[PDB]
Amino acid sequence: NKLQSQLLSIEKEVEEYKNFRPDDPARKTKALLQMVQQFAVDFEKRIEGS
Amino acid sequence: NKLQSQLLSIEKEVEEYKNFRPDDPARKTKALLQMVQQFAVDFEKRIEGS
Amino acid sequence: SELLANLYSCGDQNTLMEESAEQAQRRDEMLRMYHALKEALSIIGNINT
Amino acid sequence: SELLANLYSCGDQNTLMEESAEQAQRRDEMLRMYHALKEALSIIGNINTT
């Protein structure tokens, strides 16, 4: 049960690493879009208080 | 004054329309991000009232 | 958290993000409007002398 | 509305979105952990089967 719990908490993330490539413009583009979205949302939450 | 007002109103959008090029993946990506954000905001609005 | 990644991961994002023909007409009409307004304003400013 | 449009205008879009060394080290450690953890669960399986 402990080993399965750790695997459940890692497996959702290591999917990006297993296929990691030093040259991958699609991965870079989607990471950019997600981080920009997260920045805008975090700034709005932090200053508005919502 | 009427013509200056009309130019001021239209300029914000013609500034982007004048730069349209069919082969522009960045324009497509920007539209994608904007539309996804609008969807998420409208959904939260209609479900939570935020 | 995921909708953006799910949409981007689809192939042929070009077809996925094709604009409606109505939008292709609207932007061109606005470009013509902009140029005509600038030309008219130049003429009015010049005639005033 | 504008931040992404400006980010696409900076630099040369080649060095932007380049991973730091720490993310590469974390990637390697996470993949090692993942594979060893699956191996541990395989061995527990075999022991219970006998």
mmCIF file of C-alpha atoms in Angstrom:
data_model
loop_
_atom_site.group_PDB
_atom_site.id
_atom_site.type_symbol
_atom_site.label_atom_id
_atom_site.label_comp_id
_atom_site.label_asym_id
_atom_site.label_seq_id
_atom_site.Cartn_x
_atom_site.Cartn_y
_atom_site.Cartn_z
ATOM 1 C CA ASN A 1 0.000 0.000 0.000
ATOM 2 C CA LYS A 2 2.819 2.456 0.746
ATOM 3 C CA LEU A 3 4.686 1.681 -2.468
ATOM 4 C CA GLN A 4 1.486 1.958 -4.501
ATOM 5 C CA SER A 5 0.662 5.303 -2.885
ATOM 6 C CA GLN A 6 4.070 6.708 -3.802
ATOM 7 C CA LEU A 7 3.744 5.361 -7.332
ATOM 8 C CA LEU A 8 0.312 6.985 -7.618
ATOM 9 C CA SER A 9 1.792 10.319 -6.561
ATOM 10 C CA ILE A 10 4.718 10.106 -9.024
ATOM 11 C CA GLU A 11 3.161 8.452 -12.098
ATOM 12 C CA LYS A 12 0.993 11.475 -12.929
ATOM 13 C CA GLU A 13 4.170 13.554 -13.364
ATOM 14 C CA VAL A 14 6.782 11.171 -14.779
ATOM 15 C CA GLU A 15 4.774 10.795 -18.004
ATOM 16 C CA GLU A 16 6.345 14.025 -19.263
ATOM 17 C CA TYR A 17 9.818 12.821 -18.262
ATOM 18 C CA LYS A 18 9.646 9.381 -19.900
ATOM 19 C CA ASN A 19 9.209 11.045 -23.311
ATOM 20 C CA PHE A 20 11.475 14.004 -22.516
ATOM 21 C CA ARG A 21 13.468 15.232 -25.505
ATOM 22 C CA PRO A 22 16.037 18.057 -25.707
ATOM 23 C CA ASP A 23 14.219 19.346 -28.829
ATOM 24 C CA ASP A 24 10.421 19.460 -28.447
ATOM 25 C CA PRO A 25 8.671 22.672 -29.542
ATOM 26 C CA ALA A 26 5.202 21.332 -28.671
ATOM 27 C CA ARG A 27 6.184 20.606 -25.075
ATOM 28 C CA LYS A 28 7.759 24.052 -24.805
ATOM 29 C CA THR A 29 4.698 25.744 -26.302
ATOM 30 C CA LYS A 30 2.185 24.036 -24.028
ATOM 31 C CA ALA A 31 4.352 24.632 -20.952
ATOM 32 C CA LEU A 32 4.517 28.308 -21.912
ATOM 33 C CA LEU A 33 0.749 28.526 -22.274
ATOM 34 C CA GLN A 34 0.055 26.792 -18.968
ATOM 35 C CA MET A 35 2.548 28.935 -17.054
ATOM 36 C CA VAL A 36 1.204 32.175 -18.566
ATOM 37 C CA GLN A 37 -2.338 31.137 -17.635
ATOM 38 C CA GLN A 38 -1.230 30.273 -14.109
ATOM 39 C CA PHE A 39 0.590 33.590 -13.726
ATOM 40 C CA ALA A 40 -2.413 35.641 -14.810
ATOM 41 C CA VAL A 41 -4.761 33.700 -12.537
ATOM 42 C CA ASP A 42 -2.427 33.788 -9.538
ATOM 43 C CA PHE A 43 -1.866 37.536 -9.867
ATOM 44 C CA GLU A 44 -5.599 38.203 -10.124
ATOM 45 C CA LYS A 45 -6.357 36.041 -7.092
ATOM 46 C CA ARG A 46 -3.557 37.579 -5.054
ATOM 47 C CA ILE A 47 -4.528 41.205 -5.634
ATOM 48 C CA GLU A 48 -8.332 40.920 -5.785
ATOM 49 C CA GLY A 49 -8.632 38.427 -2.937
ATOM 50 C CA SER A 50 -10.995 36.123 -4.829
ATOM 51 C CA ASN B 1 -13.667 65.544 -33.742
ATOM 52 C CA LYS B 2 -16.057 62.928 -35.136
ATOM 53 C CA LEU B 3 -13.375 61.432 -37.368
ATOM 54 C CA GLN B 4 -10.814 61.461 -34.559
ATOM 55 C CA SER B 5 -13.240 59.645 -32.262
ATOM 56 C CA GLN B 6 -13.959 56.983 -34.876
ATOM 57 C CA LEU B 7 -10.243 56.435 -35.469
ATOM 58 C CA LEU B 8 -9.595 56.123 -31.738
ATOM 59 C CA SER B 9 -12.366 53.540 -31.396
ATOM 60 C CA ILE B 10 -11.264 51.414 -34.372
ATOM 61 C CA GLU B 11 -7.473 51.654 -33.891
ATOM 62 C CA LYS B 12 -7.311 49.089 -31.078
ATOM 63 C CA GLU B 13 -8.517 46.336 -33.434
ATOM 64 C CA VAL B 14 -7.086 47.446 -36.755
ATOM 65 C CA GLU B 15 -3.667 47.451 -35.069
ATOM 66 C CA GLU B 16 -4.012 43.657 -34.895
ATOM 67 C CA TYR B 17 -5.919 43.099 -38.139
ATOM 68 C CA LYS B 18 -3.238 44.879 -40.192
ATOM 69 C CA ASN B 19 -0.697 42.276 -38.998
ATOM 70 C CA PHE B 20 -2.670 39.200 -40.099
ATOM 71 C CA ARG B 21 -0.657 36.550 -41.931
ATOM 72 C CA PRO B 22 -2.223 33.123 -42.625
ATOM 73 C CA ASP B 23 1.052 31.361 -41.720
ATOM 74 C CA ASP B 24 1.222 32.520 -38.097
ATOM 75 C CA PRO B 25 1.059 29.814 -35.406
ATOM 76 C CA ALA B 26 1.444 32.489 -32.720
ATOM 77 C CA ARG B 27 -1.831 34.174 -33.660
ATOM 78 C CA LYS B 28 -3.553 30.787 -33.474
ATOM 79 C CA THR B 29 -1.988 30.051 -30.088
ATOM 80 C CA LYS B 30 -3.023 33.450 -28.712
ATOM 81 C CA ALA B 31 -6.605 32.945 -29.873
ATOM 82 C CA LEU B 32 -6.637 29.471 -28.330
ATOM 83 C CA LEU B 33 -5.490 30.771 -24.952
ATOM 84 C CA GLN B 34 -7.951 33.670 -24.986
ATOM 85 C CA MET B 35 -10.932 31.490 -25.874
ATOM 86 C CA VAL B 36 -10.050 28.828 -23.293
ATOM 87 C CA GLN B 37 -9.758 31.489 -20.594
ATOM 88 C CA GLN B 38 -13.120 32.972 -21.569
ATOM 89 C CA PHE B 39 -14.736 29.534 -21.392
ATOM 90 C CA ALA B 40 -13.305 28.777 -17.957
ATOM 91 C CA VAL B 41 -14.392 32.171 -16.639
ATOM 92 C CA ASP B 42 -17.935 31.830 -17.973
ATOM 93 C CA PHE B 43 -18.275 28.331 -16.515
ATOM 94 C CA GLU B 44 -17.125 29.444 -13.074
ATOM 95 C CA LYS B 45 -19.443 32.453 -13.344
ATOM 96 C CA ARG B 46 -22.483 30.307 -14.122
ATOM 97 C CA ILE B 47 -21.749 27.595 -11.503
ATOM 98 C CA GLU B 48 -20.291 29.468 -8.504
ATOM 99 C CA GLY B 49 -21.415 33.052 -9.112
ATOM 100 C CA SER B 50 -17.876 34.449 -9.028
ATOM 101 C CA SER C 1 -5.895 22.345 -15.045
ATOM 102 C CA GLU C 2 -6.219 20.068 -18.096
ATOM 103 C CA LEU C 3 -8.603 21.413 -20.759
ATOM 104 C CA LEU C 4 -5.870 23.522 -22.361
ATOM 105 C CA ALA C 5 -3.474 20.586 -22.613
ATOM 106 C CA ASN C 6 -6.199 18.327 -23.999
ATOM 107 C CA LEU C 7 -7.085 20.833 -26.716
ATOM 108 C CA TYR C 8 -3.498 21.653 -27.677
ATOM 109 C CA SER C 9 -2.541 17.971 -27.873
ATOM 110 C CA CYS C 10 -4.959 17.409 -30.762
ATOM 111 C CA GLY C 11 -3.313 17.158 -34.146
ATOM 112 C CA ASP C 12 -3.670 19.641 -36.986
ATOM 113 C CA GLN C 13 -4.085 22.734 -34.825
ATOM 114 C CA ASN C 14 -4.338 24.650 -38.112
ATOM 115 C CA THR C 15 -7.693 23.062 -38.909
ATOM 116 C CA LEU C 16 -8.617 23.254 -35.220
ATOM 117 C CA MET C 17 -8.198 27.053 -35.271
ATOM 118 C CA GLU C 18 -9.522 27.998 -38.712
ATOM 119 C CA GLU C 19 -11.355 31.330 -38.509
ATOM 120 C CA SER C 20 -14.894 31.694 -39.811
ATOM 121 C CA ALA C 21 -15.168 33.255 -43.264
ATOM 122 C CA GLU C 22 -17.312 36.010 -41.744
ATOM 123 C CA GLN C 23 -14.329 36.996 -39.593
ATOM 124 C CA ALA C 24 -12.034 37.009 -42.628
ATOM 125 C CA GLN C 25 -14.440 39.453 -44.275
ATOM 126 C CA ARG C 26 -14.944 41.621 -41.183
ATOM 127 C CA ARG C 27 -11.237 42.246 -40.599
ATOM 128 C CA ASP C 28 -10.703 43.224 -44.243
ATOM 129 C CA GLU C 29 -13.668 45.588 -44.123
ATOM 130 C CA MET C 30 -12.216 47.217 -41.012
ATOM 131 C CA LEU C 31 -8.859 47.656 -42.761
ATOM 132 C CA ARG C 32 -10.589 49.422 -45.649
ATOM 133 C CA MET C 33 -12.519 51.588 -43.187
ATOM 134 C CA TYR C 34 -9.304 52.583 -41.401
ATOM 135 C CA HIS C 35 -7.506 53.598 -44.587
ATOM 136 C CA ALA C 36 -10.489 55.537 -45.916
ATOM 137 C CA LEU C 37 -10.909 57.406 -42.623
ATOM 138 C CA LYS C 38 -7.257 58.451 -42.577
ATOM 139 C CA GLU C 39 -7.444 59.645 -46.183
ATOM 140 C CA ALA C 40 -10.614 61.640 -45.518
ATOM 141 C CA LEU C 41 -9.090 63.233 -42.423
ATOM 142 C CA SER C 42 -5.973 64.212 -44.362
ATOM 143 C CA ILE C 43 -8.136 65.832 -47.045
ATOM 144 C CA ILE C 44 -10.180 67.768 -44.483
ATOM 145 C CA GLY C 45 -7.058 68.967 -42.688
ATOM 146 C CA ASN C 46 -5.458 70.109 -45.940
ATOM 147 C CA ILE C 47 -8.489 71.956 -47.340
ATOM 148 C CA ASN C 48 -8.949 73.957 -44.114
ATOM 149 C CA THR C 49 -5.822 75.903 -45.152
ATOM 150 C CA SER D 1 -4.852 40.389 -23.200
ATOM 151 C CA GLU D 2 -1.272 41.349 -24.163
ATOM 152 C CA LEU D 3 1.345 39.499 -22.092
ATOM 153 C CA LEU D 4 1.702 36.497 -24.407
ATOM 154 C CA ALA D 5 1.916 38.696 -27.493
ATOM 155 C CA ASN D 6 4.860 40.477 -25.884
ATOM 156 C CA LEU D 7 6.578 37.269 -24.783
ATOM 157 C CA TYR D 8 6.548 36.081 -28.392
ATOM 158 C CA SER D 9 8.353 39.330 -29.302
ATOM 159 C CA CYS D 10 11.301 38.930 -26.897
ATOM 160 C CA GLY D 11 14.731 37.550 -27.722
ATOM 161 C CA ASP D 12 14.825 34.978 -30.517
ATOM 162 C CA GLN D 13 12.329 32.387 -29.167
ATOM 163 C CA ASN D 14 15.173 29.815 -29.129
ATOM 164 C CA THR D 15 16.738 30.324 -25.691
ATOM 165 C CA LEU D 16 13.382 31.147 -24.107
ATOM 166 C CA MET D 17 11.816 28.108 -22.427
ATOM 167 C CA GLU D 18 15.151 26.329 -21.898
ATOM 168 C CA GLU D 19 15.240 24.052 -18.857
ATOM 169 C CA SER D 20 17.572 24.766 -15.954
ATOM 170 C CA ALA D 21 20.059 22.164 -14.730
ATOM 171 C CA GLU D 22 18.013 21.502 -11.586
ATOM 172 C CA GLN D 23 14.979 20.357 -13.574
ATOM 173 C CA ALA D 24 17.208 17.958 -15.521
ATOM 174 C CA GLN D 25 18.604 16.489 -12.304
ATOM 175 C CA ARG D 26 15.121 16.179 -10.823
ATOM 176 C CA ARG D 27 13.954 14.462 -14.015
ATOM 177 C CA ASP D 28 16.717 11.878 -13.752
ATOM 178 C CA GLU D 29 16.079 11.208 -10.069
ATOM 179 C CA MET D 30 12.332 10.855 -10.620
ATOM 180 C CA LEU D 31 12.790 8.363 -13.459
ATOM 181 C CA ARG D 32 15.211 6.294 -11.376
ATOM 182 C CA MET D 33 12.766 6.312 -8.459
ATOM 183 C CA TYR D 34 9.855 5.320 -10.707
ATOM 184 C CA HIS D 35 11.611 2.324 -12.237
ATOM 185 C CA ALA D 36 12.992 1.000 -8.957
ATOM 186 C CA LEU D 37 9.584 1.380 -7.294
ATOM 187 C CA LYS D 38 7.845 -0.625 -10.004
ATOM 188 C CA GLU D 39 10.511 -3.300 -9.587
ATOM 189 C CA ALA D 40 9.824 -3.484 -5.845
ATOM 190 C CA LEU D 41 6.125 -4.023 -6.508
ATOM 191 C CA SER D 42 6.895 -6.728 -9.058
ATOM 192 C CA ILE D 43 8.989 -8.611 -6.507
ATOM 193 C CA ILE D 44 6.282 -8.324 -3.838
ATOM 194 C CA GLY D 45 3.859 -9.716 -6.412
ATOM 195 C CA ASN D 46 6.077 -12.698 -7.168
ATOM 196 C CA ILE D 47 6.547 -13.415 -3.460
ATOM 197 C CA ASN D 48 2.816 -13.446 -2.763
ATOM 198 C CA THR D 49 2.226 -15.698 -5.779
ATOM 199 C CA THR D 50 5.060 -18.099 -4.828
#
